Amino acid sequence: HMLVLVLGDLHIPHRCNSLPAKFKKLLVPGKIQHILCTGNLCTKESYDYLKTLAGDVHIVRGDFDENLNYPEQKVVTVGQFKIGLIHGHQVIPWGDMASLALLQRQFDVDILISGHTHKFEAFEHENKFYINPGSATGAYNALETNIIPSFVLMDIQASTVVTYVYQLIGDDVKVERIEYKKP
Amino acid sequence: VGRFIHLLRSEDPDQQYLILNTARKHFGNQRIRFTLPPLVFAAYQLAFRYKENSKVDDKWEKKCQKIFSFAHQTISALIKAELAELPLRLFLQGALAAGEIGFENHETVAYEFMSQAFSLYEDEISDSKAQLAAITLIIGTFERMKCFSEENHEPLRTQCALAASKLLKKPDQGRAVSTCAHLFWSGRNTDKNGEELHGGKRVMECLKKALKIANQCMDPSLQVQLFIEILNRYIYFYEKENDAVTIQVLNQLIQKIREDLPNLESSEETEQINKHFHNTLEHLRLR
Numbered sequence: 001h002m003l004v005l006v007l008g009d010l011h012i013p014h015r016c017n018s019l020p021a022k023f024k025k026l027l028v029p030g031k032i033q034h035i036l037c038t039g040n041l042c043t044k045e046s047y048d049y050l051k052t053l054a055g056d057v058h059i060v061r062g063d064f065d066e067n068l069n070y071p072e073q074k075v076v077t078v079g080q081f082k083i084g085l086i087h088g089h090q091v092i093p094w095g096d097m098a099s100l101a102l103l104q105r106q107f108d109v110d111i112l113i114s115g116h117t118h119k120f121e122a123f124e125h126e127n128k129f130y131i132n133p134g135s136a137t138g139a140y141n142a143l144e145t146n147i148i149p150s151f152v153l154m155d156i157q158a159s160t161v162v163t164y165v166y167q168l169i170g171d172d173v174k175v176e177r178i179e180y181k182k183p
Numbered sequence: 184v185g186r187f188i189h190l191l192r193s194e195d196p197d198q199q200y201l202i203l204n205t206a207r208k209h210f211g212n213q214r215i216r217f218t219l220p221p222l223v224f225a226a227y228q229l230a231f232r233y234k235e236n237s238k239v240d241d242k243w244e245k246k247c248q249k250i251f252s253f254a255h256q257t258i259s260a261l262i263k264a265e266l267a268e269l270p271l272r273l274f275l276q277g278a279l280a281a282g283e284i285g286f287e288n289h290e291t292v293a294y295e296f297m298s299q300a301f302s303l304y305e306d307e308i309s310d311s312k313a314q315l316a317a318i319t320l321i322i323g324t325f326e327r328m329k330c331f332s333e334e335n336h337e338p339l340r341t342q343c344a345l346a347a348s349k350l351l352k353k354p355d356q357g358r359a360v361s362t363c364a365h366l367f368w369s370g371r372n373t374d375k376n377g378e379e380l381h382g383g384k385r386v387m388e389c390l391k392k393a394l395k396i397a398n399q400c401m402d403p404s405l406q407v408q409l410f411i412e413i414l415n416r417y418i419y420f421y422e423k424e425n426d427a428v429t430i431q432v433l434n435q436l437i438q439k440i441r442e443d444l445p446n447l448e449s450s451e452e453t454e455q456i457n458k459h460f461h462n463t464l465e466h467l468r469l470r
């Protein structure tokens with residue numbers, strides 16, 4: 001019913017030159033409706049690319065974004081779900097589930113999307129859902145040596161969201177399915 | 184652009200180094216904002232490559248030293264070009280990388296990188312928003328690092344706390360001093376064999392200071408918001424099994440918030456502060 005692309009930590013041109021060819025092939029205009037982006041693009045160029053894929057694009061500010069136009073954080077409502085969005089360099093310790101949970105309480109969200117770690121995550125904790133799309137370009141990160149290019153597609157239908165994680169392993173795109181229902 | 188360098192991946196790290204150096208030498212002062220940072224990240228990437236070759240390359244430590252010199256010097260060129268925000272961040276990333284790679288004198292290099300960051304912080308970061316952003320990044324980076332002995336960890340720790348306490352705006356101070364709590368808890372040093380400091384009493388001093396600071400805010404909406412944020416910080420350490428966080432402290436703060444919350448002006452902003460508190464209570468009751 002409702003398709004939402006979730007991606008970020010591109011880090012072009014700082015750490016990477018572009019998205020993998022296989023991801024670009026999968027990401028075609030007119031298919032996705034909403035984009036939620038965790039930031040670190042890190043230039044207008046990448047914003048312009050995202051604007052090709054959909055009309056509704058929401059971006060939050062990464063630590064290396066040049067465009068300080070972007071908000072630190074955003075709350076977007078899609079259907080029955082209240083969805084929070086933040087890059088995650090402000091969440092300390094970085095990637096800590098408990099610190100993420102503090103923010104869910106503050107933002108009052110069913111789902112919290114964050115980045116920064118360059119590692120895909122999708123899990124439920126105290127009946128709330130947490131998503132990290134990872135880095136779409138598989139960008140370098142000091143704290144993790146095996147970075148896999150990843151992004152997420154949320155299929156939002158009524159009180160259920162099916163999240164598909166797309167991961168580039170070798171020259172092969174692998175897909176996983178995670179389901180979350182509102183309490 | 185400089186994204187060209189990302190397309191060049193020699194299988195041999197020694198060839199990568201040459202490639203990197205010829206690229207840097209190839210690169211006016213306007214262009215380098217976009218042209219030099221990729222080189223810095225490529226350098227960090229190469230250092231990890233040398234570590235991964237530690238069993239096979241007799242000279243890997245020396246090459247790592249060279250790479251960090253190159254990065255230091257490349258970042259310095261950006262400073263000269265009248266940039267502050269990006270060089271600060273590049274220095275932090277350099278400290279991170281050096282921290283993670285156990286080459287000879289990595290600690291000294293990590294410390295130099297952190298110092299450079301602090302220097303740019305003190306001298307060139309002018310706006311309250313930029314300062315709060317930069318200090319949060321400094322704290323967040325340092326909290327992940329495990330390479331420093333106590334003799335080096337403590338000055339950085341107290342420097343973070345000092346910088347936090349000296350932000351202009353009392354809300355900012357409150358948040359920043361509160362965030363430093365994580366350095367005393369989940370920060371690590373070599374002394375403790377890479378285990379977390381779990382300095383539970385010092386965590387309490389931080390949160391106490393943040394409360395004292397939130398008490399000095401005259402905006403009532405802002406004061407209560409900070410109170411609820413700090414409560415949540417107290418809850419975080421409670422569940423992490425900090426024995427210094429007592430139920431008396433939790434309940435007193437809960438009670439203060441209940442006292443002050445009805446006083447607020449009715450608004451959307453007030454509704455969100457109420458929901459934040461309600462969500463906090465629900466978490467404690469229902470888990």
Ligand SMILES: NC(N)=N/N=C/c1cccc(/C=N/N=C(N)N)c1
Binds near residue numbers: 266307310313
């Ligand atoms: N380094 C980058 N990307 N941008 N600006 C650097 C710079 C140079 C001189 C002063 C400042 C301080 N800026 N303060 C704000 N609020 N932009 C910042």
